[PDB]
């Protein structure tokens with residue numbers, strides 16, 4: 001009897017649901033009364049599954065209504081722990097321990113980042129005479145990203161970026177950037193939120209509108 | 213024993229973005245790509261056929277040509293993930309994964325497509341500086357039709373004129389343009405709210421008189 005882990009390392013997106021797994025042998029049908037599944041992180045109980053049910057009294061309040069064991073997956077030999085609304089604080093080392101005709105445990109590392117993939121865009125026609133527009137892209141995330149503005153040519157343009165702590169979610173950074181440029185209807189512009197180490201890019205396409 | 217499962221039975225995806233919908237199937241030891249079959253279809257269209265360790269794209273539908281793929285990355289994990297890029301209103305409907313890997317099963321997933329009025333364009337024009345008359349315009353595209361609501365920081369009653377036409381760039385969407393004529397002092401703030409239904413969604417831009 002050995003518990004095996006598909007993946008040793010998970011990288012998880014802020015605000016999503018996360019599902020991490022420990023697999024264990026199941027040949028016959030699942031005998032619930034002989035099974036124990038236990039999930040833990042930093043010595044806080046997340047899940048204790050015994051006699052076919054979750055033993056909630058033992059669960060750390062920090063996981064109340066955030067965590068569950070996917071029951072269906074058990075018959076297949078998969079202890080799959082799902083945690084909803086992932087926060088930065090959920091990064092760490094998770095330990096599962098399975099007892100079922102034998103006993104074993106594994107450790108799983110979870111990393112959490114907040115990508116700048118939710119990009120709010122807006123475009124102000126400053127002066128139709130000079131065709132001056134002001135394009136703005138904003139997003140929040142962690143760690144800090146820079147904004148690179150490019151033309152449809154992929155030439156790099158000059159912008160003004162402002163970076164502050166998010167007022168919404170505490171540990172995140174709000175990044176808004178503005179490009180001032182003379183241009184025509186249907187021209188295409190890109191605002192790319194870029195973060196290094198490891199490199200990651202999220203880009204919005206902005207099209208110059210036609211107003212009456 | 214073999215059973216296909218879906219973490220999510222329903223996805224609501226924003227028009228123009230990318231979606232990934234998932235079906236899970238049991239994998240122990242190494243994943244034998246040789247015996248694995250994964251088919252993604254929807255209504256009467258073929259999307260993805262993965263047979264004999266390779267994507268077959270012969271019988272794939274025109275709609276999906278260079279915008280559907282199975283993340284082979286996830287197959288190792290027992291996650292058959294379908295990714296479609298540049299999602300349109302036509303992509304909404306019931307999807308189905310059929311998976312064979314030492315056994316065979318299938319599940320269905322509903323996808324709903326949301327086309328919000330969240331990319332708002334605006335313009336502030338002085339129409340007559342002696343009387344400080346300005347003309348303010350907001351314009352955005354989405355589906356279905358939205359009304360525009362004009363409000364101000366001083367909480368006055370505002371009535372603009374709104375035109376709704378077919379979007380020229382996005383075939384199925386509506387282009388909604390509203391114009392408000394107002395006499396205003398500088399640095400007072402105005403708001404244009406696109407109110408849309410099904411589901412109810414409000415998106416507002418802030419217009420600041422220079």
Ligand SMILES: [Cl-]
Nearest residue numbers: 146147148161
């Ligand atoms: Cl920057």
